[PDB]
RNA sequence: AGUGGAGCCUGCGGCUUAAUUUGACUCAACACGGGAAACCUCACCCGGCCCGGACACGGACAGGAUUGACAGAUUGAUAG
């Protein structure tokens, strides 16, 4: 549960930056490079004091053995675009009722965690 | 020496503004200054649109309150101290009167 | 110039004030009393004066109690 | 309730020497006016006073999300004794002779 | 000056320094105080539970203006300090010990703070 | 033992309220009003605004 | 006007002082038979003139209450020392003063009379 | 009634059950104190204050969340 | 001149939702409670601190009631 040539058959650039190079990159470069919505998240949001969770993201990745996914990293926030150091964590994403644990991969880079967690039904009416 | 002093008058009560502007123009000529006259700046209509019905089920009843303030200036080619001396005294209520060193 | 009062104790008005608040003459003062028969101690009335020689006493003879009332000489 | 009779006496004496105390109510506020407990939401500026108020000694008037403690004659006598000050101080409610 | 009794002035010094908020009431404030020259008086009790607690203060006493008077009854000294609002049935903060305290800063005028300060110069 | 009882509220209608109460949905901000649209209906007399037409 | 609040804002802001004062002194000076206030803008003095039908509770004894009645007005509403000088106003008629009468009838209805 | 309720145990407060606050000097003949569980020097600190000898973290309590020895 | 028809908008019914907060039902509920609410707010749901038990009385209690926290466990929060 980690970086490139693994959890990626969807290859080259997600928005303008190749995920193959991106996992060798830092995300301080990725906000500069072809990631405008992520740029507005990483420059204006600017590392938004979820550091204890960000520590826990790097704690549970460290505490679990690296051939396996982390144990649990729950967040309340769902506005998180997956960073190359984030890739691999099984991130509990809260939708205001329930935590949704998502392993985050080279393909999912550029996508918010509220894009894999849902707050909404595929609407039924008896349907 | 003379000193062209603006006397700016702001009020919302016109006849209160008129009875004080009559005092300023005459009293400047009663004890001699420039007398120039009422430079009628236009009124400002402060219009605010409000709801007449709170918890507004039923009919959309709109209510508008207007408040009209009234500006004018009186530039006086007259000696600086006794422009503001004769004018600014004896008028406390109702009307803002702004004597002004500028337009020198 | 009048010194409006909410009470005015025993030297009330109507030749009780013609020698007390001042020495100079007044026109006429209304009081709710009928100031000859009852000798009733009551204040809800007023005090009219001419304000020539009246201002010097009553602003140090306000806030006081001739009986158990409280003279508010507020001039207007 | 925390904040003892050092911070409470900062609120206690400031009522007494003036004759009035002012404060404000909001949870996103933090500050009260008048030399207060220095960027706090609606507490010990009020709660030291509310402790004294529910014992009497003051009238906390209110208007427009704002509080107006009226120093009554008992709090004139109480914080006189509470601050162990000499029994006439003229607590700035008596200073003018009108 | 004056000729007041020492222990009933040891009452009011513990009463005034409590009002002065800095009567180091109990050992934590005391060891913070009596290891400082903020300490200007230290009335000990002899009825302290585990009277190494006396010696703990006595070991704290001999540095930073040694002050060693010894009264009895921690609960009296705790009353002399002031926790108990004496004239009741009981209190929210009724009678419990303040066994050894440190009077930082006598902080007031005559006899009740002057007699023992004469005496603690006459004793020491 | 409080640490969190507040959040930065400068934005939108989740930031302010009325001045004699707490209200949303019509907080008129023009010329320094800071009133909700319903309480100020009781209070329009002291100001100087008027409706003649 | 530069650099104050607008002349539009200023005549808005004039009544804002009027409303909060009258509401508050409805809450407290109703014991005077609260007829209203009169804030007179004079030089170096805010001549507040308290309209009432019982002006024997405005000073208290020896101007006691005014030094806390002003200390509400002078200190909360932005006034320097010596600015808010309180004045009584014992209004002459009260039967033309429905404000003080619906006050006084409330001393007969909530106060107790048939 | 939104979803939040909670129980309490002094989870609403703290007690830290016994609080072994400073009693701690090796007392010889009167009078001299000796350093037990490390004495902390700071300016926020007084002159008697100790550490939470919580070893590899030696937290001075008069220090706020700091001055912790790792030895 | 249109609407309704069309796409869509907003409001509402209904359903659905853990929540789709609430007010309203011909005129006199319905792009209505300037209601253009991201979360914030927020009512609602799903979760957490905290007490605002101030005060009248009484008890714990200066040996520590309480506070503060390292760091760990915890958790959305190394939020003592």
Swiss-Prot record, chain A:
InterPro entries (alphabetical): Ribosomal_uS19, Ribosomal_uS19_CS, Ribosomal_uS19_euk/arc, Ribosomal_uS19_SF
Keyword Nucleotide-binding applies: no
Chain segments annotated as coiled-coil in the UniProt record: none
Pfam families: Ribosomal_S19 (PF00203)
Sequence position, cross-link Glycyl lysine isopeptide (Lys-Gly) (interchain with G-Cter in SUMO2): 105
Record localization: Cytoplasm
One MF term in the entry's GO annotations: DNA binding
Gene Ontology BP terms: cytoplasmic translation; liver regeneration; osteoblast differentiation; positive regulation of signal transduction by p53 class mediator; ribosomal small subunit assembly; ribosomal small subunit biogenesis; ribosomal small subunit export from nucleus; rRNA processing
Gene3D superfamilies: 30s Ribosomal Protein S19, Chain A
Assigned keywords, A-Z: Acetylation, Cytoplasm, Isopeptide bond, Ribonucleoprotein, Ribosomal protein, Ubl conjugation
Disulfide bonding pattern of the chain: none
Top-rank taxon, per record: Eukaryota
GO CC terms, sorted: cytoplasm; cytosol; cytosolic ribosome; cytosolic small ribosomal subunit; focal adhesion; membrane; nucleoplasm; nucleus
Role according to the record: Component of the small ribosomal subunit. The ribosome is a large ribonucleoprotein complex responsible for the synthesis of proteins in the cell.
SUBUNIT field: Component of the small ribosomal subunit.
Family to which the UniProt record says this protein belongs: Belongs to the universal ribosomal protein uS19 family.
Name of the protein: Small ribosomal subunit protein uS19
Species classification: Eukaryota, Metazoa, Chordata, Craniata, Vertebrata
Annotated gene: RPS15
From Swiss-Prot, chain B:
UniProt GO cellular component terms: cytoplasm; cytosol; cytosolic ribosome; cytosolic small ribosomal subunit; extracellular exosome; membrane; nucleoplasm; synapse
MF GO annotations: MDM2/MDM4 family protein binding; RNA binding; structural constituent of ribosome; ubiquitin ligase inhibitor activity
Domain of life: Eukaryota
Subcellular location(s) per record: Cytoplasm
Keyword set, alphabetical order: Acetylation, Cytoplasm, Isopeptide bond, Phosphoprotein, Ribonucleoprotein, Ribosomal protein, Ubl conjugation
Post-translational modification: Polyubiquitinated by ZNF598 via 'Lys-63'-linked ubiquitin chains when a ribosome has stalled, initiating the ribosome quality control (RQC) pathway to degrade the potentially detrimental aberrant nascent polypeptide. Deubiquitinated by OTUD3 and USP21, antagonizing ZNF598 activity.
SMART domains: Ribosomal_S10 (SM01403)
GO BP term, example: positive regulation of signal transduction by p53 class mediator
Major site of localization recorded for this protein: cytoplasm
Positions of post-translational N6-acetyllysine modification: 19, 60
InterPro entries per the UniProt record, alphabetical: Ribosomal_uS10, Ribosomal_uS10_CS, Ribosomal_uS10_dom, Ribosomal_uS10_dom_sf, Ribosomal_uS10_euk/arc
Modified residues (Phosphoserine): 78
Pfam family, one: Ribosomal_S10
Binding partners and assembly: Component of the 40S small ribosomal subunit.
Similarity comment: Belongs to the universal ribosomal protein uS10 family.
Function: Component of the small ribosomal subunit. The ribosome is a large ribonucleoprotein complex responsible for the synthesis of proteins in the cell.
Cited PANTHER family: 30S RIBOSOMAL PROTEIN S10 FAMILY MEMBER
Annotated protein name in UniProt: Small ribosomal subunit protein uS10
Organism: Homo sapiens (Human)
Swiss-Prot record, chain E:
GO BP, sorted A to Z: cytoplasmic translation; maintenance of translational fidelity; positive regulation of canonical Wnt signaling pathway; ribosomal small subunit biogenesis; translation
Transmembrane regions listed in the UniProt entry: none
GO cellular component: a single term: nucleoplasm
Family: Belongs to the eukaryotic ribosomal protein eS12 family.
Modification N6-succinyllysine, positions: 121
Function in brief: Part of the small subunit (SSU) processome, first precursor of the small eukaryotic ribosomal subunit. During the assembly of the SSU processome in the nucleolus, many ribosome biogenesis factors, an RNA chaperone and ribosomal proteins associate with the nascent pre-rRNA and work in concert to generate RNA folding, modifications, rearrangements and cleavage as well as targeted degradation of pre-ribosomal RNA by the RNA exosome. Subunit of the 40S ribosomal complex.
Principal location class: cytoplasm
PROSITE patterns for this protein: RIBOSOMAL_S12E
Signal peptide: none
PANTHER family: 40S RIBOSOMAL PROTEIN S12
Keywords associated with the record: Acetylation, Cytoplasm, Nucleus, Ribonucleoprotein, Ribosomal protein
Subcellular location: Cytoplasm; Nucleus, Nucleolus
An MF annotation (GO) of this entry: RNA binding
Quaternary structure, from the entry: Part of the small subunit (SSU) processome, composed of more than 70 proteins and the RNA chaperone small nucleolar RNA (snoRNA) U3. Subunit of the 40S ribosomal complex.
Name under which the protein is recorded: Small ribosomal subunit protein eS12
Domain of life from the UniProt record: Eukaryota
UniProtKB/Swiss-Prot annotation, chain H:
N6-acetyllysine PTM positions: 23, 32, 71
Organism, scientific name: Homo sapiens
ZnF segments: C4-type: 40-63
Protein name, per record: Small ribosomal subunit protein eS31
Subcellular location: Cytoplasm; Nucleus, Nucleolus
Function: Component of the 40S subunit of the ribosome. Part of the small subunit (SSU) processome, first precursor of the small eukaryotic ribosomal subunit. During the assembly of the SSU processome in the nucleolus, many ribosome biogenesis factors, an RNA chaperone and ribosomal proteins associate with the nascent pre-rRNA and work in concert to generate RNA folding, modifications, rearrangements and cleavage as well as targeted degradation of pre-ribosomal RNA by the RNA exosome.
Subunit note: Part of the 40S ribosomal subunit. Part of the small subunit (SSU) processome, composed of more than 70 proteins and the RNA chaperone small nucleolar RNA (snoRNA) U3.
Cross-link type Glycyl lysine isopeptide (Lys-Gly) (interchain with G-Cter in ubiquitin), residue numbers: 26, 32
PTM info: Monoubiquitinated at Lys-26 and Lys-32 by RNF25 in response to ribosome collisions (ribosome stalling): ubiquitination promotes subsequent activation of RNF14, leading to EEF1A1 ubiquitination and degradation and rescue of stalled ribosomes. Deubiquitination at Lys-32 by USP16 is required for maturation of the 40S ribosomal complex.
Region (Disordered): 1-14
Residue span relative to the full protein: 82 to 152 of 156
């Amino acid at each position: 549960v980690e970086q490139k040539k693994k959890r990626t058959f969807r290859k080259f650039t997600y928005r303008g930056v190749d995920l193959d190079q991106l996992l060798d990159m830092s995300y301080e470069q990725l906000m500069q490079l072809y990631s405008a919505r992520q740029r507005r998240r990483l420059s204006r949001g600017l590392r938004r004091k979820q550091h204890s969770l960000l520590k826990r993201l790097r704690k549970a990745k460290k505490e679990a053995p690296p051939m396996e996914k982390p144990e649990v990293v729950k967040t309340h926030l769902r506005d998180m675009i997956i960073l190359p150091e984030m890739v691999g964590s099984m991130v509990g994403v809260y939708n205001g009722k329930t935590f949704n644990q998502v392993e985050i991969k080279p393909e999912m880079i550029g996508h918010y965690l509220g894009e894999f967690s849902i707050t909404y039904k595929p609407v039924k009416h008896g349907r | 020496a003379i000193h062209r002093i603006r006397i700016t008058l702001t009020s919302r009560n016109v006849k209160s503004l008129e009875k004080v502007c009559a005092d300023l123009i005459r009293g400047a000529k009663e004890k001699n200054l420039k007398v120039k006259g009422p430079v009628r700046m236009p009124t400002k209509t402060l219009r605010i649109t409000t709801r007449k019905t709170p918890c507004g089920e039923g009919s959309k009843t709109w209510d508008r309150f207007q408040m009209r303030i009234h500006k004018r200036l009186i530039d006086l080619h007259s000696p600086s101290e006794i422009v503001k001396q004769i004018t600014s005294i004896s008028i406390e209520p109702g009307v803002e009167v702004e004597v002004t060193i500028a337009d020198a | 110039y009048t010194a409006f009062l909410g009470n005015l104790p025993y030297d009330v008005t109507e030749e009780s004030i013609k020698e007390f608040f001042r020495g100079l003459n007044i026109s006429a003062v209304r009081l709710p009393r009928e100031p000859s028969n009852p000798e009733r101690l009551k204040g809800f009335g007023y005090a009219e004066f001419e304000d020539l020689d009246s201002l010097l006493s009553a602003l140090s003879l306000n806030e006081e109690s001739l009986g158990n009332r409280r003279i508010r000489v507020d001039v207007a | 309730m925390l904040m003892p009779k050092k911070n409470r006496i900062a609120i206690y004496e400031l009522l007494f020497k003036e004759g009035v105390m002012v404060a404000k109510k909001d949870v996103h506020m933090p500050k009260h006016p008048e030399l207060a407990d220095k960027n706090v939401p609606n507490l010990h500026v009020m709660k030291a006073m509310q402790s004294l108020k529910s014992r009497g000694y003051v009238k906390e008037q209110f208007a427009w999300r704002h509080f107006y403690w009226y120093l009554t004659n008992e709090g004139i006598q109480y914080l006189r004794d509470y601050l162990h000050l000499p029994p006439e101080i003229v607590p700035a409610t008596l200073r003018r002779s009108r | 000056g004056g000729v007041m009794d020492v222990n009933t002035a040891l009452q009011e010094v513990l009463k005034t320094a409590l009002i002065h908020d800095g009567l180091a009431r109990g050992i934590r404030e005391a060891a913070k105080a009596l290891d400082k020259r903020q300490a200007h008086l230290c009335v000990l009790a002899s009825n302290c539970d585990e009277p190494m607690y006396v010696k703990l203060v006595e070991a704290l006493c001999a540095e930073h203006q040694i002050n060693l008077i010894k009264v009895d009854d921690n609960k009296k000294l705790g009353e002399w300090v002031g926790l108990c609002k004496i004239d009741r049935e009981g209190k929210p903060r009724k009678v419990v010990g303040c066994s050894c305290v440190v009077v930082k800063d006598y902080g007031k005028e005559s006899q009740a703070k002057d007699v023992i300060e004469e005496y603690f110069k006459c004793k020491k | 033992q409080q640490l969190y009882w507040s959040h930065p509220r400068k934005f939108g209608q989740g930031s302010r309220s009325c001045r004699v109460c707490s209200n949303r949905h019509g907080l008129i901000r023009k010329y320094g009003l800071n009133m909700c649209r319903q309480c100020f209906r009781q209070y329009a007399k002291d100001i100087g605004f008027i409706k003649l037409d | 006007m530069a650099v104050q609040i607008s002349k539009k804002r200023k005549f808005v802001a004039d009544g804002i002082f009027k409303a909060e004062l009258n509401e508050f002194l409805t809450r407290e000076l109703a014991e005077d038979g609260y007829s209203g206030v009169e804030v007179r803008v004079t030089p170096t003095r805010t001549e507040i003139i308290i309209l009432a039908t019982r002006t024997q509770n405005v000073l208290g004894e020896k101007g006691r209450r005014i030094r806390e009645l002003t200390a509400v007005v002078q200190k909360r509403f932005g006034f320097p020392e010596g600015s808010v000088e309180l004045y009584a106003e014992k209004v002459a008629t009260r039967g033309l003063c429905a404000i003080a009468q619906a006050e006084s009838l409330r001393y007969k209805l909530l106060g107790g009379l048939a | 009634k939104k979803s939040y309720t909670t129980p309490k145990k002094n989870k609403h407060k703290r007690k830290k059950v016994k609080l072994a606050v400073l009693k701690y000097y090796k007392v010889d003949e009167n009078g001299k104190i000796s350093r037990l569980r490390r004495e902390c020097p700071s300016d926020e600190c007084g002159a008697g204050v100790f550490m939470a000898s919580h070893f590899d973290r030696h937290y001075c309590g008069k220090c706020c969340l700091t001055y912790c020895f790792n030895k």
